[PDB]
Amino acid sequence: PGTVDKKMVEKCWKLMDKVVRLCQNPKLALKNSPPYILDLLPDTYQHLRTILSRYEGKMETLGENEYFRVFMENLMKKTKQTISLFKEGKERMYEENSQPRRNLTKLSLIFSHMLAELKGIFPSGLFQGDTFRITKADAAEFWRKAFGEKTIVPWKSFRQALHEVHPISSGLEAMALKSTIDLTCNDYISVFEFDIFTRLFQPWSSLLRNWNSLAVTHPGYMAFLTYDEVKARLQKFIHKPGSYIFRLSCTRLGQWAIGYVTADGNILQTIPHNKPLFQALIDGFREGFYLFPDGRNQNPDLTGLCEVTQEQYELECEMGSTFQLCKICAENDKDVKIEPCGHLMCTSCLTSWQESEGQGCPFCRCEIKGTEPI
Ligand code: NA
Ligand SMILES: [Zn+2]
Ligand SMILES: [Zn+2]
């Protein structure tokens, strides 16, 4: 990734301007709900101006900073990808539920994560990547031992280092993990992304089993939603007290929020504090609040996560080995992803479901907007 100079910054601002103008189109009728691309790109522009200001008469130093170089390459690639999406999408961009339009939401989330990361690494415009404080102590010790004060690490190197303490036992597991951690979708892991991941999937001692059981195999997991989208989803279960879902929030990375239907006709949400999510969900099940994930009658049993020992390493190795298998047949490897639910399976099981007249996704019955080969 090349040195950042005045010309490159100029080209990025023009590319951002084009994306903003494409997204102002009244026919898209974007609601200002997060991630709101019409605020994010102006806000990213503004924070870059703050950086450039702090580095006035020091552009040669800023322009060589590795994080900054990688960020500006990604900003240019992501804006070009968004412009390309409109060009190829044509009138489908105006269909609220088209895949092109859902792809715009995905890019908008990425722009949101990129701005959060930039603000975290350049608070007030000054590079502070090398003094970034990782929240969880074990995760912080891991990063320092493997990487020192580095702000970003190529995925290939991050994987090899993490594997030494938390085995990544299969290629498919690695791809799923990368999609979870690499928020900015650029094949680098920053200290900021690592901080987020290790807060979400604490405790460190069972990191990857926590991730699998919360983000892969749990029907209550909604990934990034707004609170209005959570309420909209649970309102369908307003007459089933104990129905619950849990989500990430693009405006507050590193935290979970659990929405649930009460016994009195209300929907509330709780942000768990000083408690891993799985313990929050065990407690809430026992207490009668979190009974029916996404309104389903069956709730996962997370107590196997209760207690890096040698035993943890072996449990994670086994989970990672089984990860690649399609869980409908338990025979073929996963090789297709359903959109928009994101569930993975083999194409044999998808076909069999469809040939039997089965509707929507074989796991969750969500309508299939498209599929993507793995
Ligand atoms: Na990244
Ligand atoms: Zn299968
Ligand atoms: Zn599904």
Side-chain angles (χ1 to χ4, degrees), residues 1-6 8-10 12-13 15-17 19-26 28-30 32-55 57-86 89 93-132 134-155 157-297 299-310 312-313 315-326 328-368 370-371 373-374:
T3 298
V4 192
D5 56 18
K6 193 191 149 301
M8 183 186 198
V9 179
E10 283 302 317
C12 286
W13 291 347
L15 286 158
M16 296 168 74
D17 279 341
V19 172
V20 162
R21 289 179 190 284
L22 286 157
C23 291
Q24 285 170 331
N25 186 340
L28 315 169
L30 299 181
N32 75 343
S33 59
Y36 189 28
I37 190 154
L38 295 178
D39 291 345
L40 291 167
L41 287 181
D43 286 349
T44 303
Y45 169 74
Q46 285 303 314
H47 199 78
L48 288 167
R49 298 274 281 170
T50 298
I51 298 175
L52 296 168
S53 186
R54 296 287 297 215
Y55 282 87
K58 309 180 61 124
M59 289 305 312
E60 292 82 5
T61 289
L62 175 56
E64 281 284 80
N65 177 276
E66 189 189 7
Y67 174 82
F68 196 60
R69 283 188 292 112
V70 172
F71 179 94
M72 293 301 297
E73 190 179 274
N74 198 38
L75 176 61
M76 174 172 310
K77 288 188 190 158
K78 294 289 182 294
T79 56
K80 283 182 191 166
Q81 180 175 13
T82 305
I83 297 166
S84 172
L85 173 74
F86 278 90
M93 284 294 126
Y94 314 136
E95 290 152 27
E96 228 160 58
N97 298 291
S98 73
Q99 193 52 240
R101 181 72 171 264
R102 278 161 189 190
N103 287 350
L104 179 65
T105 300
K106 288 191 195 315
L107 283 160
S108 299
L109 276 168
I110 293 162
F111 283 122
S112 180
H113 306 328
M114 283 163 70
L115 178 62
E117 187 191 70
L118 190 68
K119 291 188 169 174
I121 300 306
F122 284 87
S124 295
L126 183 63
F127 177 73
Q128 305 255 84
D130 60 326
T131 69
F132 189 94
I134 296 166
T135 295
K136 289 310 199 275
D138 295 309
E141 288 263 19
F142 169 80
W143 189 274
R144 181 162 310 276
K145 173 177 309 193
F147 306 132
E149 307 185 294
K150 279 176 81 64
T151 300
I152 40 162
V153 175
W155 167 255
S157 310
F158 178 84
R159 185 178 167 181
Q160 283 310 290
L162 179 60
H163 185 84
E164 300 181 23
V165 303
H166 286 294
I168 297 142
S169 321
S170 85
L172 270 157
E173 188 193 22
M175 293 307 89
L177 192 59
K178 192 189 171 295
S179 175
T180 299
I181 309 166
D182 177 15
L183 294 173
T184 67
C185 296
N186 71 341
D187 301 331
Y188 283 87
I189 305 304
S190 68
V191 69
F192 175 88
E193 284 166 323
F194 174 77
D195 180 59
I196 293 323
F197 184 84
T198 56
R199 292 156 66 182
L200 288 172
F201 297 110
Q202 62 186 100
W204 176 260
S205 57
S206 50
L207 187 71
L208 297 188
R209 281 176 66 236
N210 304 340
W211 163 77
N212 178 64
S213 293
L214 300 166
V216 177
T217 71
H218 203 305
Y221 171 69
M222 300 286 113
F224 284 98
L225 290 180
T226 71
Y227 188 40
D228 285 347
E229 290 168 322
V230 165
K231 278 185 285 166
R233 196 160 177 132
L234 293 164
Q235 185 69 34
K236 319 183 292 175
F237 309 112
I238 196 68
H239 301 295
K240 191 175 192 177
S243 290
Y244 78 95
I245 61 186
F246 53 94
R247 53 145 181 150
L248 306 168
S249 166
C250 61
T251 71
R252 190 76 201 204
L253 298 172
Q255 71 170 18
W256 291 106
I258 310 166
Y260 59 105
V261 171
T262 73
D264 42 65
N266 195 16
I267 296 162
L268 295 176
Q269 74 168 345
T270 295
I271 306 259
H273 294 294
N274 301 127
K275 210 198 258 175
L277 177 58
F278 78 81
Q279 194 66 61
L281 294 172
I282 290 162
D283 293 344
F285 181 78
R286 184 192 55 254
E287 288 168 33
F289 296 110
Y290 312 153
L291 297 178
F292 309 114
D294 203 20
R296 298 186 190 288
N297 279 325
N299 195 51
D301 184 339
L302 300 178
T303 61
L305 301 173
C306 298
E307 211 73 329
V308 189
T309 56
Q310 186 61 30
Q312 268 306 141
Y313 192 89
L315 287 168
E316 288 186 331
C317 199
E318 289 169 24
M319 178 280 288
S321 284
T322 301
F323 188 94
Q324 51 212 320
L325 292 183
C326 170
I328 295 163
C329 58
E331 181 164 50
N332 299 319
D333 279 3
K334 291 165 184 175
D335 63 10
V336 61
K337 182 195 215 178
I338 309 307
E339 299 283 350
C341 60
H343 288 135
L344 308 187
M345 66 200 68
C346 74
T347 68
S348 170
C349 288
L350 177 64
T351 299
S352 295
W353 174 243
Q354 293 172 322
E355 293 178 338
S356 85
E357 301 301 327
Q359 298 309 280
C361 175
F363 288 112
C364 74
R365 304 294 180 272
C366 182
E367 310 196 39
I368 298 174
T371 72
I374 307 307

